[PDB]
Amino acid sequence: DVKGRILDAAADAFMARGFANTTIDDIADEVGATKGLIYYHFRSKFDIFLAVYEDGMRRVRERVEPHSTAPGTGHQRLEAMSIAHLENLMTELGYHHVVHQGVRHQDSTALKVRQRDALTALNELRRDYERMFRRVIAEGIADGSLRRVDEALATRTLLSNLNAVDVWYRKIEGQTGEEIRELASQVVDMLIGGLAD
Amino acid sequence: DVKGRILDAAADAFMARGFANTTIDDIADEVGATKGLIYYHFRSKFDIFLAVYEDGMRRVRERVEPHSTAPGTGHQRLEAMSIAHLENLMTELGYHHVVHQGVRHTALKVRQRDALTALNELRRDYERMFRRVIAEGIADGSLRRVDEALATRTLLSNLNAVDVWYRKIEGQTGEEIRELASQVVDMLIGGLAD
Amino acid sequence: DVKGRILDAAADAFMARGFANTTIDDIADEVGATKGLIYYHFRSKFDIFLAVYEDGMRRVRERVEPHSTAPGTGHQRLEAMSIAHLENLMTELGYHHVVHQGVRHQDSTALKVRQRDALTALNELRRDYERMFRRVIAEGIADGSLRRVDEALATRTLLSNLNAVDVWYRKIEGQTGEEIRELASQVVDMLIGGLAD
Amino acid sequence: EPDVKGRILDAAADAFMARGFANTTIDDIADEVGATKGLIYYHFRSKFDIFLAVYEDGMRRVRERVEPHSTAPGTGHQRLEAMSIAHLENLMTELGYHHVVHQGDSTALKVRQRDALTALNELRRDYERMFRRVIAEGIADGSLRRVDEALATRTLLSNLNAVDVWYRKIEGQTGEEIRELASQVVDMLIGGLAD
DNA sequence: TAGATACTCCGGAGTATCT
DNA sequence: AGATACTCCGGAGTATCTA
């Protein structure tokens, strides 16, 4: 809808300059409207952050979730989903770096009630996403395919691993689904397989 | 002394809230004086950032550059390197969080854009050595033969983002830290499924 | 049109007090609105200094350019050009001051990359305009009219010296065009002619 | 041996020329001389003091090293041509000091110090008085042409001053070579273009 | 859309006290 | 005799609101 036009606009500017440096008129001329359309559709500057958070975080789930019931060993099964995770990062890059930031801004802001409720739901529904990988690494060492390492560290770092890719990856904007998934092929196995022999 | 007291109080403060929402007097009550002595030593709020970015990295290349010519193979030196790298990240995570966060990002003096750039590609010198020991780690290969250009930029990036989940387990000795950095690099260098 | 009125007041204010003593509120007062109007049309304080500086370069070029492409010798072109150059100083005295103190403190003061570059993106328009006065002083130094003297310093001197009229010039409000043209012709004979014969 | 206050004013004057009067701060003047703010404020009562201390010395430099060419023998042109030379040399050795002279009350100022700026601006017109005479002593003398001696004074010293637009520095040449660089310019301003 | 209003936070001059 | 530190304050900029 029209809201997504601002959501698409704010996302890229949110990576380039963060939250506070991103001013409301810094994203007003970018989409091509005065400050009213931002305030007609979004009651506050924090609301834009949450709506982008509430969209992109479902974007990730809706694109990885069906890879959890498909059959395979926990290395074969999880590699299948986590390839599609780097896929989602690279296609809708705007909605994927916003999920790194967050609680940093809740501290600095004197929060309204509605954002504090919406933030909380997103606060654990990311944790529930962590449960998926916390769930489907278990089958990795339950079907005997992964290094028998700590059940928490393997989860915490690998999601920390997968998301840190947006430090160097800028864009291609023309990268077909082949080069997207085939760049996603060598980066998951780089982390999954490691560097050892 | 007095300056070093401010740099610490500024470093963790920049980590805790971010350069944008860390007011000058917000970092002045941690040291116990008024903004007067915070601005007396550093002419700008951006100059403090450059005084942390230049010590935080100077304190990380004093552990991991020593492990460039040492008793080890490709992995046995790279593991020794990445332990002492992720070591200081674990001890002074305040001084760490500025560098890789403060990359994508404003008004800037002539002596500041270059001074930030002359420090933002000194971080490329840190990256230069890690690609140098992955090539050394492939000729005398104890590690896999994947492409250099991207695998060099991943593991270092993978190992700077340890802080997103990493707490501060209070009471750590020198022994706790190096072992705490042990299983994470073996998580990361050795990887999984091996 | 209001943006021009902001530039008109800004050029008046910027000339009289400078850049520093010119506060955002001052331009708002001389236009007749609050601080918000000034920021509704411009991203920053400096982003209007380019607007005054960029517009002022058009004004002279729109009215001084034909006199370089006109019949006559090197003397007959400078006089037709230099008079019209002073006809701009003596009419829009505000705009013409902005193109003096724009290069000096550029290093010593902060600017965004899209602003400091936009500064020197217009600072060629000074040199690309001084090119016209190097192109026609040229066609006199060897082609008859102008005294044989180095092409470079004669362009440094003349331009810096018919631009130094703002030191003493004071616009008598209620001015007429034929009065200003007469005063311009007076000074030029002082400048191109000299004092010898 | 060295002079503390002189090192402050020489460093401050060039600071005023580059950044401006506002863009240079008090600690900015503490860096070029390599000192602390308290040294500035134990010697100078305020930052406006700095500006009247270089203005007072800019004149004593400008007014003194150019006066002996209004009394030197020669016509009104012979005086003026050599008079403008020692003025250009002066600007080109005292870039900060001379640029202050044409860098002049829109706010309430301290009376004791205000009463010196307006006076200092009266040694100002006192300087262009000599330019007023030698031009008038030359226009109908014959060495110069017929010109509005008011205009010929306004537009000439403002022109001889207009050099600091492009002249940065050399600091490799000396009096003999700086004589050449000023010579071509006064020959421009005095001689003209068309012949 | 067009501005007005509130308000913060950065930086600088000036002053007070200590070195 | 300067240094160090503090205090006061201006004003640029940005968020929210109101016509």
Residue numbers in the entry:
A (entry chain F), C (entry chain T): 10 to 206
B (entry chain A): 10 to 114, 118 to 206
D (entry chain G): 8 to 111, 116 to 206
Pull verbatim passages from the article behind this deposition.
However, to deduce the molecular mechanism of operator recognition by DarR, we next determined the structures of the Rhodococcus sp. USK13 and M. baixiangningiae DarR proteins in complex with a 20 bp site containing a double stranded (ds) DarR DNA operator, 5´-TAGATACTCCGGAGTATCTA-3´ (annealed to its complement). The structure of the Rhodococcus sp. USK13 DarR-DNA complex was solved first by selenomethionine SAD and refined to 2.96 Å resolution. This structure was then used to determine the 3.49 Å resolution structure of the M. baixiangningiae DarR-DNA complex. The Rhodococcus sp. USK13 DarR-DNA complex showed a pair of interacting DarR dimers in complex with the DNA (herein referred to as dimer-of-dimers) in the ASU while the M. baixiangningiae DarR-DNA structure contains two such complexes. These DarR-DNA complexes show the identical DNA binding mode, whereby the dimer-of-dimers partially encase the DNA using an electropositive surface. The same protein-DNA contacts are observed in the Rhodococcus sp. USK13 and M. baixiangningiae DarR-DNA structures. The distance between DarR recognition helices was found to be 39 Å for both DNA bound Rhodococcus sp. USK13 and M. baixiangningiae DarR dimers. By contrast, our DarR-DNA structures reveal that the centrally bound subunits of each of DarR dimer makes critical inter-subunit contacts. These β-sheet like interactions are formed between residues 116-125 of each subunit. Notably, these residues are adjacent to residues that interact with the inducer ligand in the M. baixiangningiae DarR structure and hence would be subject to allosterism.
